[PDB]
Design a protein around this ligand. Structure first.
Ligand SMILES: NCCCC[C@H](NC(=O)OCc1ccccc1)C(=O)N[C@@H](CCc1ccccc1)C(=O)N[C@@H](CCCCN)[C@H](O)c1nc2ccccc2o1
Length: 247
């Protein structure tokens, strides 16, 4: 996250860190005791399931905490429509090896229904431990960063992405995607934020509106972050989780 601030411990208790071979690669959002939602693109086919971990209840990734818990994965379920980068369906259900116990620092975020609308301009928050500037990693001890971002329609977003575009480097915001951020840049999600929450306030609660997906250069003007809409997958998530792990 570039241009944000450090959250306070426990503020975003659904935020998880996903690591591959012990290195943070992506965020995720806890959605039940044994399920995490992240980005499909965080889980390429060449990676081995056994090398992933999920760290929950963390604030400073580098700091010891008796509140943080680390898990392996039993299942990685990318949405079947995700074919390649920029594809629709950049979303994955992750089943933890075992169920965790909710705590003050580990709590799920509510999923929106399929027809949840989050209107343009809504001030949502994206969080993560990804880069704080182009190719600049968050400094140890890696306190979770947060950034308030207003929602930007895919239509506006597409037109912004066209400004000074390289015709070879296309960027198309699809119907399952939304943007959020600022036309002048300097404030966005960045590399290593992928997979994490865009959390939006609705009726006193917080919903997982978006999953950090892609953009252009960290904090580039005319390039607000692109997110997969969780609402687009609410039916699929409910179906998958209900069949695989009925309550
Ligand atoms: N390197 C600086 C420049 C980065 C720009 C790049 N854009 C791009 O390729 O457009 C292609 C396109 C073509 C056609 C239609 C649309 C899009 C980009 O966003 N790539 C994603 C990962 C790949 C990806 C690309 C398209 C879709 C889905 C996934 C990335 O970096 N996502 C970050 C979060 C970024 C948050 C908003 N800026 C997450 O944290 C993470 N995923 C990563 C995977 C590997 C390594 C680092 C990663 O970081």
């Amino acid at each position: 996250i570039t241009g944000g601030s450090s959250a306070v411990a426990g503020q975003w208790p659904w935020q998880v860190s996903i690591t591959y071979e012990g290195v943070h690669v992506c965020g995720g959002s806890l959605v039940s005791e044994q399920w995490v939602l992240s980005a499909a693109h965080c889980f390429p086919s060449e990676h081995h399931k056994e090398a992933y971990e999920v760290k929950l209840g963390a604030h400073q990734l580098d700091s010891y905490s008796e509140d943080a818990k680390v898990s392996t994965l039993k299942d990685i379920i990318p949405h079947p429509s995700y074919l390649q980068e920029g594809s629709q369906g950049d979303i994955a259900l992750l089943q933890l090896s075992r169920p965790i116990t909710f705590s003050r620092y580990i709590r799920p975020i509510s999923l929106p229904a399929a027809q949840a609308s989050f209107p343009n301009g809504l001030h949502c928050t994206v969080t993560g431990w990804g880069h704080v500037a182009p190719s600049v990693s968050l400094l140890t001890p890696k306190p979770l960063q947060q950034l308030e971002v207003p929602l930007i329609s895919r239509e506006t977003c597409n037109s912004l992405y066209n400004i000074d575009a390289k015709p070879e480097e296309p960027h198309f915001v699809q119907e399952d995607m939304v943007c959020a951020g600022y036309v002048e840049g300097g404030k966005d999600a960045c590399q290593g934020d992928s997979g994490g929450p865009l959390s939006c306030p609705v009726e006193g609660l917080w919903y997982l509106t978006g999953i950090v997906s892609w953009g252009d250069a960290c904090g580039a003007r005319n390039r607000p972050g692109v997110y997969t809409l969780a609402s687009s997958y609410a039916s699929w998530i409910q179906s998958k989780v209900t069949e695989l792990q009925p309550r």
